[PDB]
Scaffold this active site. Structure first.
Site, PDB file in Angstrom:
ATOM      1  N   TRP A 130      97.928 -20.615  82.794  1.00 14.70           N
ATOM      2  CA  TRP A 130      99.557 -21.603  82.352  1.00 14.70           C
ATOM      3  C   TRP A 130     100.111 -20.443  80.870  1.00 14.70           C
ATOM      4  CZ3 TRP A 130     101.727 -25.464  78.488  1.00 14.70           C
ATOM      5  CH2 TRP A 130     103.568 -25.807  78.755  1.00 14.70           C
ATOM      6  N   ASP A 211      94.752 -30.811  79.373  1.00 14.99           N
ATOM      7  CA  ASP A 211      96.356 -30.973  78.937  1.00 14.99           C
ATOM      8  C   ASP A 211      96.356 -31.515  80.526  1.00 14.99           C
ATOM      9  OD1 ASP A 211      99.388 -29.909  79.845  1.00 14.99           O
ATOM     10  OD2 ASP A 211      98.696 -28.109  79.469  1.00 14.99           O
ATOM     11  N   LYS A 246     106.596 -35.047  85.485  1.00 13.48           N
ATOM     12  CA  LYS A 246     106.454 -35.008  87.147  1.00 13.48           C
ATOM     13  C   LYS A 246     106.843 -36.039  87.652  1.00 13.48           C
ATOM     14  CE  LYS A 246     105.645 -29.641  85.377  1.00 13.48           C
ATOM     15  NZ  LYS A 246     104.623 -29.469  84.744  1.00 13.48           N
TER      16      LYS A 246
HETATM   17  C1  LIG Z   1     104.813 -29.127  82.811  1.00  9.45           C
HETATM   18  C2  LIG Z   1     103.347 -29.303  82.325  1.00  9.45           C
HETATM   19  C3  LIG Z   1     102.835 -28.951  80.985  1.00  9.45           C
HETATM   20  C4  LIG Z   1     103.926 -30.217  79.883  1.00  9.45           C
HETATM   21  O1  LIG Z   1     105.531 -30.042  81.042  1.00  9.45           O
HETATM   22  P1  LIG Z   1     106.641 -31.213  79.545  1.00  9.45           P
HETATM   23  O2  LIG Z   1     108.143 -30.716  80.569  1.00  9.45           O
HETATM   24  O3  LIG Z   1     106.737 -30.087  78.456  1.00  9.45           O
HETATM   25  O4  LIG Z   1     106.133 -32.091  79.339  1.00  9.45           O
HETATM   26  C5  LIG Z   1     101.665 -28.543  80.440  1.00  9.45           C
HETATM   27  N1  LIG Z   1     101.039 -28.034  81.517  1.00  9.45           N
HETATM   28  C6  LIG Z   1     101.206 -27.663  82.440  1.00  9.45           C
HETATM   29  C7  LIG Z   1     100.266 -27.267  83.285  1.00  9.45           C
HETATM   30  C8  LIG Z   1     102.413 -28.273  83.058  1.00  9.45           C
HETATM   31  O5  LIG Z   1     103.106 -28.180  84.505  1.00  9.45           O
HETATM   32  O1  LIG Z   2     106.821 -24.577  86.424  1.00  9.44           O
HETATM   33  C1  LIG Z   2     106.141 -24.734  85.509  1.00  9.44           C
HETATM   34  O2  LIG Z   2     104.969 -24.547  85.206  1.00  9.44           O
HETATM   35  C2  LIG Z   2     106.306 -26.514  84.932  1.00  9.44           C
HETATM   36  C3  LIG Z   2     107.594 -26.269  84.463  1.00  9.44           C
HETATM   37  C4  LIG Z   2     107.094 -26.266  83.329  1.00  9.44           C
HETATM   38  C5  LIG Z   2     107.685 -24.558  82.569  1.00  9.44           C
HETATM   39  C6  LIG Z   2     107.584 -23.595  81.956  1.00  9.44           C
HETATM   40  C7  LIG Z   2     107.329 -24.365  79.786  1.00  9.44           C
HETATM   41  C8  LIG Z   2     106.937 -25.579  80.382  1.00  9.44           C
HETATM   42  C9  LIG Z   2     107.305 -26.170  81.835  1.00  9.44           C
END
Ligand SMILES: *Cc1c(COP(=O)(O)O)cnc(C)c1O
Ligand SMILES: O=C(O)CCc1ccccc1
Ligand SMILES: *Cc1c(COP(=O)(O)O)cnc(C)c1O
Ligand SMILES: O=C(O)CCc1ccccc1
EC number: 2.6.1.1
Lengths: 396, 396
Positions: A130, A211, A246
């Site tokens: 990510w 995470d 989510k």
């Molecule tokens: C969405 C997500 C997060 C956390 O996102 P927030 O909207 O800041 O809670 C962290 N790691 C991954 C891989 C995610 O997809």
């Molecule tokens: O599309 C995603 O990977 C989840 C949403 C997201 C994107 C970037 C920063 C935090 C959360």
């Protein structure tokens, strides 16, 4: 003073949102950022949430600052969700939880705490990973290294290549694992593979950091927590960065938690106090709204029941869109075989498209995906499926 | 890993709340943390806020992630409150604002951005200062030096020492000013002193950073913005960290902003791209609730009317408790003359009490103040005035 500042590049994911919001094209399709859309093409507020909100409006009598670590009951609820009905971490009071602005904020909080109170110098992340994992970590002054994970030719989790990668990681290093719904691959370890990695990390001397942003989108609440729960039986210490963005559709209210575990109470207490100090030097205390929502729901039998149903509904709709995606690709005359996609979980699909294919799909057809070839299945609908599938096909 | 962590000392202000919470002596009084209380001793939710919230409950259709910089409306409105209705700053597109989690968050965002993108190495704060300024800056790796400010003996602003102490500031150093309602002194420069300080700073080569969290509690919304506005006319570059916690009673929703000013549109644009990058590496995007409430109220004529009045009422109630406080001290036995208290602005009074004096008030009588001897006038009521004035008297 700013004459010399250099223009930063934009957020590869979130920046895509602006790109999106600027085309004036009629049939644009957003398969970008990980938002859950419904049949009708929208990003709804869940019903249990609206219900919760109504409750808050009528019953809240103050906006008083929360304590640095947030709402206590939110803390409790998080832990059971995380560790189990009557887990020992809980029973032994070995865990401390702080409410944070999203799991993004819990990531930063963990990084600052680590960098300041421990001897950690490096963090190991999966390849691919990510994008924001790297920014957060580097920001705290930590080094980010990658470990092998995804088998591109076979669309699988390459275990031994993973294992051989991590053999290079030193005792005292931090190893970052995604709880379920690996982003962006969709490929998760087996319970067996999880048990192996847990045994090994105990022998090797690694501090594990989870995470966990997708609880409930793989197979279910309690089952999506197995890997984590397996690590937890073996470990003295660990850290969980969890998100409710989510599973509650509460994206913009930023609701998450940083959970810290140590061998025992006295130790977790001392350690947690340094975590609170890292918060104090950051945002001070967390936003009440979203988290009060979550605790209200988790705490009420009726509300909870409705919520779990909405979650199961979300998951199923996605499982359906995935089957429908491959079928239509098929029926639309794709070159490749895309059935591996059925084997991934969570919202996305690591499609195998190239950088230039993704770029083309967008200039040319108004379809938006992440450069890495990651496509949002949850943004798919029966009404956008055909055009979508045609675009892809056109580019292969 | 966590074995040797040393427990951190608690937040001098927020830690007091905890103790407050655990005290079970019946008539305890809280004059610690800077919260606005009412005649009946409650920390109420504003009426304009409750309305705006109902509005959101009914009209919100999505929880979609906001952008890194937050709600545009919020930004636009913030800059008006800040620089006034038709300022050149706004017309020339020289300012960019990011919505952040409180002013605390805006302080951190400014710190990370400066630390990473310029040669800034030192931040100058006043003596006495607000305890958290030190923590935030240090965390970003910046040196905090103090500048002379308050004259204990005559309870006033010592312009000379002020000016003499800043002589050591180097070109390129950051100088931090409180917009109005100096926390904790309550002593603000005059407009002419502000005009002088603004001349120097330009001459001496400093980057000013305003901490503006009490707009409307001194004299009024526009009057309170004079100093900042005077600075804004001379300066090419400026940083403003503002908050809506107090003027909207939205303490726990964490609503604030960080405004960046440069000599030009292009420059501010490039510079703000780096600010966004610093946010991305932190909490990602801001919490919607509170800020949506603020934009709602500021953008609606009638809600805005109710609001301004609520704010005027708060200010007025405080000025009333101020006079009643001194009157009762005197009429109750005080040795000292506390009349200087009447000349301070905002919620508090730098009472001139000793560390041992405050410890005692707490221990013996259940009255809670901050160690520096700062007392919350806004926490005072016609019903608690008597017993509190006596506690004080007994420790003199
Ligand atoms: C969405 C997500 C997060 C956390 O996102 P927030 O909207 O800041 O809670 C962290 N790691 C991954 C891989 C995610 O997809
Ligand atoms: O599309 C995603 O990977 C989840 C949403 C997201 C994107 C970037 C920063 C935090 C959360
Ligand atoms: C209240 C206050 C702040 C900001 O507080 P938030 O609740 O984080 O917005 C910053 N500086 C001073 C001096 C304050 O009193
Ligand atoms: O009381 C104050 O000084 C204002 C509230 C506050 C207290 C501690 C940290 C951030 C804000």
């Amino acid at each position: 003073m700013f004459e010399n500042i250099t223009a930063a590049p934009a957020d590869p994911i979130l920046g895509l949102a602006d790109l999106f919001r600027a085309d004036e094209r009629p049939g644009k399709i957003n398969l970008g950022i990980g938002l859950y859309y419904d049949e009708t093409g929208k990003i709804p507020v869940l019903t249990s949430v609206k219900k919760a909100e109504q409750y808050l409006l009528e019953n809240e009598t103050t906006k008083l600052y929360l304590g640095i670590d947030g709402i206590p009951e939110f803390g409790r609820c998080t832990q059971e969700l995380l560790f189990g009905k009557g887990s020992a971490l809980i029973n032994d009071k070995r865990a401390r939880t702080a409410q944070t602005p999203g799991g993004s904020g819990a990531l930063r909080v963990a990084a600052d705490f680590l960098a300041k109170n421990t001897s950690v110098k490096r963090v190991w992340v999966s390849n691919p990973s990510w994008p924001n994992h790297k920014s957060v970590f580097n920001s705290a002054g930590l080094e980010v290294r990658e470990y092998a994970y995804y088998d591109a030719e076979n669309h699988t989790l390459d275990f031994d290549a993973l294992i051989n990668s991590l053999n290079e990681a030193q005792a005292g290093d931090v190893v970052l694992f995604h709880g379920c719904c690996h982003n962006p691959t969709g490929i998760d370890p087996t319970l067996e593979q999880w048990q192996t990695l847990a045994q090994l990390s105990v022998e090797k001397g690694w501090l594990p950091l989870f995470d966990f942003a997708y609880q409930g989108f793989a197979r279910g609440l309690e089952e999506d927590a197995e890997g984590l729960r397996a690590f937890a039986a073996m470990h003295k210490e660990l850290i969980v960065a969890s998100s409710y963005s989510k599973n509650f559709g509460l994206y913009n209210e930023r609701v998450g938690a940083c959970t810290l575990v140590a061998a025992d109470s006295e130790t977790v207490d001392r350690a947690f106090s340094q975590m609170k100090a890292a918060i104090r030097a950051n945002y001070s205390s967390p936003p009440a709204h979203g988290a009060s929502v979550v605790a209200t729901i988790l705490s009420n039998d009726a509300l909870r029941a409705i919520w779990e149903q909405e979650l199961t509904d979300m998951r199923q709709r996605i499982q359906r869109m995935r089957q429908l995606f491959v079928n239509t690709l098929q029926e639309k005359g794709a070159n490749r075989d895309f059935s591996f996609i059925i084997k991934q979980n969570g919202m996305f699909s690591f499609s195998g498209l190239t950088k230039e294919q993704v770029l083309r799909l967008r200039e040319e057809f108004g379809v938006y995906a992440v450069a890495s070839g990651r496509v949002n299945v949850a943004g798919m609908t029966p009404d956008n499926m055909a055009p979508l599938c045609e675009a892809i096909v056109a580019v292969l």
